[PDB]
Amino acid sequence: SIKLQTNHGTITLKLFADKAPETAANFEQYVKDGHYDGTIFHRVIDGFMIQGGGFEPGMKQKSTRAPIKNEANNGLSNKKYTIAMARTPDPHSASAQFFINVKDNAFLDHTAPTAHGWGYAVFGEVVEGTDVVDRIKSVATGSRAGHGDVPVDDVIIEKAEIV
């Protein structure tokens, strides 16, 4: 139901509104408010995941709304192609940034309601365009500012829309 038109192709996402209600609603809102238009996948790590939704070209961090509670304990594993919320070490700090697993990453799953075990909340999955994710994951990257794994050439989310 969500379409991410990027300069590498279009990624279509299906959200799990019931299994991760607060997270799905938070994401959909950002899309609706056009917050993701013009953002990049600033952290691309082959064999791990691709993260975006927080920076504009030149690593310019956008403002966000208040954090959301962590819904990682919903029984959903960080399987290949699932989308989940990136965050601060603080479990309940997720805001606008998300990542798409490019590999089964069980280690990211909730194990306990503890600082280190809270895990990362899966709230959807790439329904169409997994090939787009497969290509993005292997693009050239390098360090910039206090960021590593930044794509040499910007991977841009031109527009995100609810369909």
Partner: peptide, 4 residues
Amino acid sequence: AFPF
């Protein structure tokens, strides 16, 4: 910066 997470997940690490």
